[PDB]
Design a protein around this ligand. Structure first.
Ligand code: CLA
Ligand code: CLA
Ligand code: CLA
Ligand code: CLA
Ligand SMILES: CCCCCCCCCCCCCCCCCC(=O)OC[C@H](CO[C@@H]1O[C@H](CO)[C@H](O)[C@H](O)[C@H]1O)OC(=O)CCCCCCCCCCCCCCCCC
Ligand SMILES: CCCCCCCCCCCCCCCC(=O)OC[C@H](COP(=O)(O)OC[C@@H](O)CO)OC(=O)CCCCCCCCCCCCCCC
Ligand SMILES: CCCCCCCCCCCCCCCC(=O)OC[C@H](COP(=O)(O)OC[C@@H](O)CO)OC(=O)CCCCCCCCCCCCCCC
Ligand SMILES: CCCCCCCCCCCCCCCC(=O)OC[C@H](COP(=O)(O)OC[C@@H](O)CO)OC(=O)CCCCCCCCCCCCCCC
Ligand SMILES: CC1=C(/C=C/C(C)=C/C=C/C(C)=C/C=C/C=C(C)/C=C/C=C(C)/C=C/C2=C(C)CCCC2(C)C)C(C)(C)CCC1
Ligand SMILES: CC1=C(/C=C/C(C)=C/C=C/C(C)=C/C=C/C=C(C)/C=C/C=C(C)/C=C/C2=C(C)CCCC2(C)C)C(C)(C)CCC1
Ligand SMILES: CCCCCCCCCCCCO[C@@H]1O[C@H](CO)[C@@H](O[C@H]2O[C@H](CO)[C@@H](O)[C@H](O)[C@H]2O)[C@H](O)[C@H]1O
Ligand SMILES: CCCCCCCCCCCCO[C@@H]1O[C@H](CO)[C@@H](O[C@H]2O[C@H](CO)[C@@H](O)[C@H](O)[C@H]2O)[C@H](O)[C@H]1O
Ligand SMILES: CCCCCCCCCCCCCCCC(=O)O
Ligand SMILES: [Fe+2]
Lengths: 33, 35, 28, 120, 35, 341, 81, 33, 64, 30, 505, 33, 35, 30
């Protein structure tokens, strides 16, 4: 199929940037006590 | 000059002012009478 | 006074005949 | 595709069982948002402004986490006093019953149009 | 020291919910990104 | 104490129907919107704007009456009664579709008044105003569909007409011309509405089936006191049940009820965003890769290509009568048929 | 509650019935005479069952101009007359 | 017990045109079509 | 709190926090100006909408 | 690469289902 | 701890760090403006302003710079089509560089204000608490905004000290940046009159100066101070978001309908010009005026400018795109190379047939050829359907007047059918589709993209205004309602007035 | 230029995945006390 | 509970050094990834 | 997108230079 190439990077960043954000917050919540 | 649409606009503005003034005058009168 | 069940039954029958009149007009 | 061909062959939009189903799902979404907003509106102050209000509730606590009387007072003033549930059990039964009955009727509508009893 | 700083928290349930939101949104919008 | 203070005390007095300051906006506008709809569906035709009968007086029933949109040549005119189109004549105003703009504008300001009423009652009662926040989603839907969508299009004509079958026509129009089911914003709207219905049913059934035995009767409804401080159902038992049935369960009641707020409101907001896109014809009509593949391969057939063919059929067979101002004359040979594909 | 007389006490009152056994038939008769005498067709501009189409034409009378729509409707009504 | 209350106004502004419209619609049911 | 030259210059502009005019003040004049603003917005709206047509005011590209 | 993307996102969702069910934060009474 | 969606609430009682965050946002926005201008300059093709203008190339920020007077580049080209030329420093590149430098300076200022947050200026002199006197802040800012508005109207737009603004003919043929005199009559409220824009900015700037002076000098009423919660910065956020979504709806509307501030030479045509056949009427008027003067059809159609014919083409209609069809308009039908001329269709009697034009609603449209009355004389049947008005059975020929194929005539049915399929789009143009791998699927102009973004943003900002107004008006109960909330306060028939303890019966 | 398109996503992942990793570790180090 | 778990640390200097390593490696290898 | 990538990585490196110089963890004696 002749898809938009940038769709790949778009989807990847759409997965990566928010998820990472949440992961960062979660991990720094677990290290607090 | 005053176009027919400008006269219509004046009629609409006056009708809205009359409706609001009548509403607020009646509400103020009943509020004063009740308490 | 009039009992409440009498009023409820009368209102129900009136609403039933107005619905039946509308459906009769629909079929006509 | 199934939806469009079904509308072509049976006129499902004009079928009252599908209209009952739409009332069921629209009302279910409405009452879901309504119940959520009324409970969230009447939460009892147990936390600070920095803390999330969800931490005000303890899992398995015995006391009610929201003031149902305040929620009933709000909703009674919003429409009128007799359109509001003072009984939480009656309210939750209504929340269960409305979309379930609506979806029952729309599933039965699909079955009855399967036997080619079509909409108006 | 600035006295207005506060600690930030995100529990595991919020992590799971946020990951579910992001992944489902990506699954929905990936076909439109590829087009 | 001042006329403002005395009026304020009168407006917020406890009574059967609360008035408030917001009532001055809400009750006239909502009453006029409802009365205009009833008047239009009872008496007013759509013969000169659509070429349709849409009133009980013409012989229509409850499903087929509507207050139809103005004619396409009206553009986005406000169509005031005293405006340059009707020129004060009530009969021509009704014939030109002025009742539609009457209902739409008074309904918009009535929705504003109802949300202000929610804010006002939340202020006096002393609760947080989350009901107003939740009501922002029906307002977003109404503004996007009945105002923003026709304003982006050519005229008020392409807004929904206030009626049952007219709304059904609006649904079929959006399928045929916009491919609105393929739009992901509509997909999130559908997910929000169906998830809200699911949450309503599941939460009601869960509460009703985890009730504490608080009375001796077999009808449990009388076993609840509104002023009681204890929970009427077991959250622990409900959490255990749904954890073992579904894998996950709510454990925070406040988060549960916020989630019940969040799901349909977010769905409706997403659908409103998609409707704004459709107002500018920025539709998710097609996938370009599948269009190219179908162009280069006659044997390629998916359900999406079949849906495109169905949309073409909808457009060509409904356009001459649904858009009478365009004077579409489609001869029989140009009408798409399955036996010619 | 709120200082108003209850609805049940109102509707079960004989005085309520004796007021509302006259006013309600009067309004019903007013609406019936509004439709039956044909005043509704004139007030709202709704065509009569013989007034949809002109005697010679079978074209639907759509309005096509914004600022001449009133005159266009009047022209259609004159051509059916 | 007063009579000319806000409740009276709301009930009657919804009630009087309702009966007028119902009489109108019944007279519509007896149109020859 | 650190004192700066620009801070000392700007200090009179941030020294009247919470001071109010008693009672209703200029609220009726504000209401008059709000009503006039509403009328002005209505005027420009109906001019754009072509509900209000004025002589010498053609709301079109051809007016240029 | 578009098929791989869809399958990858779906597999991530299934793995998240596993972790959300079996490695959840345990609800504790009181 | 704080939830994620509340992290920035650490700034609420910290004016210095709030200023630092605002400076950081301003640096980010200015840096976006500079980098977007540089990217557009790297991708822009200035060679053909007639058939490949900026709105065919997906240029978003270039039309705004062109709107306020920036028409040249340091490379020597101009958007009006001139080579050579001296734009001075304030070329497109100069504007982009100024924005990048501004972004860097604001970033450094944000760093300073973040580090040195504890300034005496932000503290209340008699209590030592962080306090902002918001009404006098509003007065100062409104005075500054009025001064800037007045200066922009009186000096920039007028051309007294400044370049003026983009003005154009009604058909977008000869647009240029010109000085504009203010229009003080009622025609200043015509949205298509640039003199109205100038007069607005002068008058509204003067009014803003007066109102800013008023808000500096006189204090708010105590009633309004309590009702609007003027000691709370969140009320400023709520009303500001309200005004911002109002302005966003206004700019979306004026972009979509068109105005003097959205010229078609910079943003492309509107959908309503296709709907009303605006350019087709002008082209037919010019052709008839040439024909009555004594020319033939070939000379009358050869006098039509290619730009005017390019406006009469549905591929330039902003209501023809798609939500996920990305990129410039040239990515669709291609880069326009030349006008092919006007297609006149005739039957075997030589009677003129007219192709019915595609409306914007239709993703696809049938080809129908009618005579001047409106009755159908020919058509292209749907795929393999049987026919009685096909092009073969009634001998349809097409003749091109003007353009590339001026004087030619085609009679073979496939060529005539292909030209009719293109003629449903309006004027027929030759397209180069290989340079960008154009797919032949229409995209929208920057007019449509701007309108979409700003309408969606305005709706979301309506929600934001609702949320923040609710937060400022209900600040005392947003951690939950009173635990000791009286049931008599919420029950009926206990107080006369709702929520008033004093009205207890 | 006719580059490999995947280079883009490659480069982005080559930037994103390790750096994010470090950021995660750094942030959870700062929240420990 | 597992008694072998130990806290993991990354100071800001190590963050800067790792970011420098990653970004410089990306700048070096990006031309070869694009090729 | 190639030039954009190179300039973006370079800008990230320069920003990292800024943060490593002016926002370093300060060395403390003893
Ligand atoms: C809550 C009250 C309320 C509100 C908000 C509206 C709102 C509206 N009505 Mg409406 N209406 C109402 C009550 C209300 N109505 C009632 C009670 C009735 C029954 C009588 C009507 C009957 C009615 C009709 C029949 C029509 C409307 C219409 C309209 C719309 C346009 C009106 C317009 O341009 O007025 C503009 C005027 C104002 C906003 C008044 C402003 C007053 C200013 C602030 C005071 C200054 C005026 C000054 C003193 C007067 C000097 C004039 C002089 C210079 C000549 C608008 C949405 C029209 C419509 O919907 O068209 C489709 C229409 O045709 N209304
Ligand atoms: C010295 C200051 C300065 C100058 C001269 C410019 C100049 C320019 N900028 Mg720019 N900019 C600046 C600072 C500046 N910028 C800063 C600080 C930022 C960061 C916030 C930006 C961010 C920015 C962006 C994002 C963009 C520009 C763009 C542009 C160009 C077009 C401007 C335009 O259309 O404005 C339009 C301006 C308005 C419509 C102003 C609306 C003002 C509202 C209506 C005020 C409402 C509130 C008001 C107080 C109400 C009271 C009024 C009272 C008088 C009654 C132009 C070359 C554009 C461009 O082409 O980029 C390359 C573009 O897209 N700028
Ligand atoms: C006001 C915003 C705005 C607008 C109107 C435009 C307009 C334009 N840009 Mg542009 N741009 C912008 C901001 C904007 N830009 C910004 C901020 C950047 C920096 C990232 C860029 C970077 C940029 C580049 C690099 C390019 C453009 C291009 C273009 C043009 C083609 C548009 C296109 O392909 O759209 C595509 C639009 C979409 C696919 C719509 C996206 C919709 C999103 C994905 C929906 C998200 C839904 C969300 C996840 C739901 C959450 C749900 C949750 C809340 C529950 C057009 C003129 C192109 C061009 O032709 O330039 C010459 C081009 O190459 N722009
Ligand atoms: C001028 C605009 C403006 C400003 C200054 C604020 C400021 C604030 N809002 Mg608010 N808001 C706005 C507009 C604005 N809002 C709008 C338009 C909406 C409707 C969508 C909301 C809805 C909203 C809610 C529902 C809530 C706030 C909250 C808050 C507070 C904390 C925010 C925070 O920590 O976010 C932190 C945010 C993140 C860490 C990530 C957000 C990422 C988003 C979802 C996607 C990415 C967006 C992208 C990066 C930016 C694009 C810019 C866009 C304009 C083009 C803060 C005072 C919260 C509050 O009141 O706390 C007490 C809160 O609960 N806001
Ligand atoms: C930083 C961290 C996060 C970064 C990534 C964020 C997530 C991934 C990106 C999301 C995808 C969005 C673009 C789709 C991909 C694509 O193909 O774009 C690609 C397009 C560019 O288009 C390209 O152009 C080229 C020549 O310019 C060629 O023609 C290409 O074929 C064409 O694809 O990029 C853009 O236009 C991006 C800017 C988009 C601005 C639109 C604004 C209008 C709508 C905004 C309203 C918001 C809605 C709110 C809803 C709630
Ligand atoms: C048909 C059944 C009516 C709805 C009941 C099923 C809903 C499912 C929700 C999930 C379980 C919900 C759940 O657990 O509910 C439980 C709820 C309360 O339980 P109780 O134990 O107190 O009462 C039920 C029995 O034990 C009898 O005492 O039961 C009821 O309220 C039953 C009411 C019977 C009413 C008789 C029929 C009335 C018909 C109403 C609709 C007719 C009009 C339709 C118009 C379109
Ligand atoms: C034989 C048993 C069969 C088990 C089947 C597996 C079911 C898995 C259910 C979802 C697990 C993941 C939940 C993550 C999130 C998670 O772990 O949430 C757990 C969370 C627990 O809430 P608590 O009340 O404990 O949280 C309170 C506070 O911490 C709030 O942060 O539950 C919810 O919030 C329920 C509402 C979301 C329910 C989402 C269900 C949607 C499922 C389908 C949608 C995606 C389909 C994609 C298809 C490609
Ligand atoms: C708590 C008891 C009910 C629980 C179940 C409720 C489920 C929901 C059902 C709702 C419909 C039926 C209501 C219960 C019915 C019920 O309980 O019956 C009894 C109740 C009357 O009882 P009372 O005689 O005690 O009420 C009169 C009081 O004023 C006491 O003096 O009926 C009504 O309220 C009449 C409804 C028509 C009133 C029409 C007024 C219209 C005026 C305009 C209103 C505008 C408001 C909106 C503003 C934007
Ligand atoms: C427009 C207009 C206006 C207004 C008016 C009004 C406001 C009116 C009202 C009206 C009304 C207010 C009416 C009413 C009506 C009603 C009706 C017509 C009813 C019906 C009913 C029925 C039919 C029933 C049903 C049912 C149900 C639902 C349930 C159960 C079953 C049954 C079926 C029984 C004015 C003049 C101001 C101005 C100008 C314009
Ligand atoms: C420091 C310094 C400097 C420098 C500077 C610079 C170099 C800057 C840059 C800057 C820049 C270069 C910036 C940029 C920015 C950007 C941005 C900020 C962007 C954003 C974006 C966004 C936000 C987006 C979004 C989205 C997307 C993703 C898609 C979908 C849609 C939307 C639109 C939503 C100098 C040397 C001069 C001097 C002084 C100092
Ligand atoms: C490609 C996408 C990249 C996305 C990047 C996302 C950036 C996210 C930044 C993380 C924000 C958290 O930042 C971190 O917060 C925690 C609290 O939450 C702070 O921690 C603070 O509180 C904790 C808890 O009492 C104390 O033990 C600690 O001593 C104190 O400093 C850290 O000092 C700070 O560094
Ligand atoms: C796309 C690429 C994605 C990359 C993903 C990379 C994954 C990185 C995972 C990092 C693992 C850190 O995991 C986290 O470690 C810290 C210590 O370091 C632990 O923290 C532990 O020690 C600290 C310090 O004494 C205590 O305050 C805390 O109570 C204790 O649990 C956390 O309980 C654990 O969750
Ligand atoms: C007369 C011609 C020269 C005018 C020069 C004016 C320059 C300064 C304008 C400042 C405007 C302002 O922002 O208040
Ligand atoms: Fe509940």
């Amino acid at each position: 199929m002749e898809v938009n190439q940038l769709g790949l990077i778009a989807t990847a960043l759409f997965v990566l940037v928010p998820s990472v954000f949440l992961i960062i917050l979660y991990v720094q919540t677990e290290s607090q006590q | 000059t005053i176009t027919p649409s400008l006269k219509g606009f004046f009629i609409g503005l006056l009708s809205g002012a009359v409706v609001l003034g009548l509403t607020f005058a009646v509400l103020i009168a009943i509020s004063q009478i009740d308490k | 006074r009039i009992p409440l069940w009498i009023v409820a039954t009368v209102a129900g029958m009136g609403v039933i005949v107005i619905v039946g009149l509308f459906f009769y007009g629909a079929y006509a | 595709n199934f939806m469009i061909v079904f509308q072509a062959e049976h006129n499902i939009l004009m079928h009252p069982f599908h209209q009952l189903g739409v009332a069921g799902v629209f009302g279910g979404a409405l009452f879901c948002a309504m119940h959520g907003s009324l409970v969230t509106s009447s939460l009892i102050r147990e936390t600070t402004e920095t803390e999330s209000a969800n931490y005000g509730y303890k899992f398995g606590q015995e006391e009610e986490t929201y003031n149902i009387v305040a929620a009933h007072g709000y909703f009674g003033r919003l429409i009128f006093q007799y359109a509001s549930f003072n009984n939480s059990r009656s309210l939750h039964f209504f929340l269960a019953a409305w979309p379930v009955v609506g979806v029952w009727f729309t599933a039965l509508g699909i079955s009855t149009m399967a036997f080619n009893l079509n909409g108006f | 020291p600035n006295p207005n700083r506060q600690p930030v928290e995100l529990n595991r349930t919020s992590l799971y919910l946020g990951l579910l939101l992001i992944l489902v949104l990506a699954l929905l919008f990936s076909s439109y990104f590829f087009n | 104490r001042g006329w403002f203070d005395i009026l304020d005390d009168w407006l917020k007095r406890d009574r059967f129907v609360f008035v408030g300051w917001s009532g001055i906006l809400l009750f006239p506008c909502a009453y006029l919107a409802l009365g205009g709809w009833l008047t239009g569906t009872t008496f007013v035709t759509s013969w000169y704007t659509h070429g349709l009968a849409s009133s009980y007086l013409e012989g229509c029933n409850f499903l087929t009456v509507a207050v139809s949109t103005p004619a396409n040549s009206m553009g986005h005119s406000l169509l005031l009664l005293w405006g340059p189109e009707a020129q004060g004549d009530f009969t021509r105003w009704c014939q030109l579709g002025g009742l539609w703009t009457f209902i739409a504008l008074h309904g918009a300001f009535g929705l504003i008044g109802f949300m202000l009423r929610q804010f006002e009652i939340a202020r006096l009662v002393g609760v947080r105003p989350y009901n107003a926040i939740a009501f922002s989603a029906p307002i977003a839907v109404f503004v996007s569909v009945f105002l923003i969508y026709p304003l982006g299009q050519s005229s008020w004509f392409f807004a929904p007409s206030f009626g049952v079958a007219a709304i059904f026509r609006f649904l079929l129009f959006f399928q045929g011309f916009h491919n609105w089911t393929l739009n992901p914003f509509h997909m999130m709207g559908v997910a929000g509405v169906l998830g809200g219905a699911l949450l309503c049913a599941i939460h009601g059934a869960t509460v009703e089936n985890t009730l504490f035995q608080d009375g001796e009767g077999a009808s449990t409804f009388r076993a609840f006191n509104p002023t009681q401080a204890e929970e009427t159902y077991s959250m622990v038992t409900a959490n255990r049940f749904w954890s073992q049935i579904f894998g996950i369960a709510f454990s925070n009641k406040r988060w549960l009820h916020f989630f019940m707020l969040f799901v349909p409101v977010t769905g409706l907001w997403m659908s409103a965003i998609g409707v704004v896109g459709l107002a500018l014809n920025l539709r998710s009509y097609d996938f370009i890769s599948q269009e190219i593949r179908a162009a280069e391969d006659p044997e390629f057939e998916t359900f999406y290509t079949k849906n495109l063919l169905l949309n073409e059929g909808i457009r060509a067979w409904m356009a001459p009568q649904d858009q009478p101002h365009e004077n579409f004359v489609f001869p029989e040979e140009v009408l798409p048929r399955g036996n010619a594909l | 509650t709120t200082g108003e007389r209850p609805f049940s006490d109102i509707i079960t009152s004989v005085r309520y019935w004796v007021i509302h056994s006259i006013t309600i038939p009067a309004l019903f008769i007013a609406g019936w005479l509004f439709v039956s005498t044909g005043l509704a067709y004139d007030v709202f501009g709704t065509p009569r069952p013989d007034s949809y189409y002109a005697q010679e034409q079978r074209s639907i009378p759509l309005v096509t101009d914004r600022f001449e729509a009133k005159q266009q409707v009047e022209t259609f009504l004159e051509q059916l007359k | 017990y007063p009579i000319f209350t806000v409740r009276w106004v709301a009930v009657h502004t919804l009630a009087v045109p309702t009966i007028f419209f119902l009489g109108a619609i019944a007279a519509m049911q007896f149109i020859q079509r | 709190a650190r004192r700066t030259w620009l801070g000392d210059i700007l200090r009179p502009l941030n020294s009247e926090y919470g001071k109010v005019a008693p009672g209703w003040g200029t609220t009726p004049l504000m209401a008059v100006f709000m009503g006039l603003f509403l009328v002005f917005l209505l005027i420009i709206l109906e001019i754009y909408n072509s509900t209000l047509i004025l002589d010498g005011v053609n709301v079109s590209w051809k007016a240029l | 690469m578009e098929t791989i993307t869809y399958v990858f996102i779906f597999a991530c969702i299934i793995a998240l289902f596993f972790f959300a069910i079996f490695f959840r934060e345990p609800p504790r009474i009181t | 701890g704080l939830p994620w969606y509340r992290v920035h609430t650490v700034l609420i009682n910290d004016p210095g760090r709030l200023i630092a965050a605002h400076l950081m946002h301003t640096a980010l926005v200015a840096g976006w403006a500079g980098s977007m201008a540089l990217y557009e300059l790297a991708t822009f093709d200035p060679s053909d302003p007639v058939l490949n203008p900026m709105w065919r190339q997906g240029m978003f920020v270039l039309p705004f710079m062109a709107r306020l007077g920036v028409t040249g580049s340091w490379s020597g080209w101009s958007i009006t089509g001139e080579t050579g030329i001296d734009p001075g420093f304030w070329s497109f590149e100069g504007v982009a560089l100024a924005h990048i430098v501004l972004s860097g300076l604001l970033f450094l200022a944000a760093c300073w204000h973040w580090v040195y947050w504890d300034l005496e200026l932000f503290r209340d002199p008699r209590t030592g608490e962080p306090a902002l006197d918001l009404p006098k802040m509003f007065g100062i800012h409104l005075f500054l905004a009025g001064l800037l508005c007045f200066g922009f109207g009186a000096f920039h737009l007028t051309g007294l000290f400044g370049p003026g603004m983009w003005v154009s003919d009604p058909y977008g043929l000869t647009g240029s940046v010109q000085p504009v005199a203010p229009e003080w009559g009622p025609d200043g409220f015509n949205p298509y009159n640039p003199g109205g824009v100038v007069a607005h900015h002068i008058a509204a700037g003067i009014v803003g100066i007066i109102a800013g002076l008023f808000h500096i000098l006189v204090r708010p009423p105590q009633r309004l101070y309590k009702a609007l919660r003027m000691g709370n910065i969140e009320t400023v956020l709520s009303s500001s978001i309200a005004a911002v979504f109002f302005a966003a709806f206004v700019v979306a509307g004026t972009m979509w309908y068109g105005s003097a501030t959205t010229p078609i030479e910079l943003f492309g045509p509107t959908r309503y010009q296709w709907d009303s056949s605006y350019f087709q009427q002008e082209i037919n008027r010019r052709v008839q005026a040439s024909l009555a003067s004594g020319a033939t059809l070939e000379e009358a159609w050869s006098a039509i400018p290619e730009k005017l014919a390019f406006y009469d083409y549905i591929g330039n209609n902003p209501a023809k795109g798609g939500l996920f069809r990305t990129g410039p308009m040239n990515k669709g039908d291609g880069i326009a190379q030349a006008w092919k001329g006007h297609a006149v269709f005739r039957n075997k009697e030589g009677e003129e047939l007219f192709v019915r034009r595609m409306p914007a609603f239709f993703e696809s449209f049938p080809v129908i050829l009618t005579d001047k009355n409106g009755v159908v004389k020919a058509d292209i049947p749907f795929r393999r359907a049987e026919s009685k008005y096909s092009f073969e059975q009634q001998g349809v020929t097409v003749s091109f007047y003007g353009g590339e194929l001026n004087g030619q005539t085609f009679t073979d049915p496939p060529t005539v059918k292909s030209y009719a399929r293109k003629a449903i789009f309006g004027e027929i143009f030759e397209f180069d589709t290989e340079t960008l791998n154009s797919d032949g699927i229409f995209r929208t102009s920057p007019r449509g993209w701007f309108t979409f973004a700003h309408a969606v943003f305005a709706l979301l900002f309506f929600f934001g205004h609702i949320w923040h107004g609710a937060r400022t008006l209900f600040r005392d109960v947003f951690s939950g309602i009173d635990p000791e909330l009286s049931p008599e306060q919420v029950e009926w028939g206990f107080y006369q007035k709702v929520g008033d303890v004093t009205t207890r019966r």
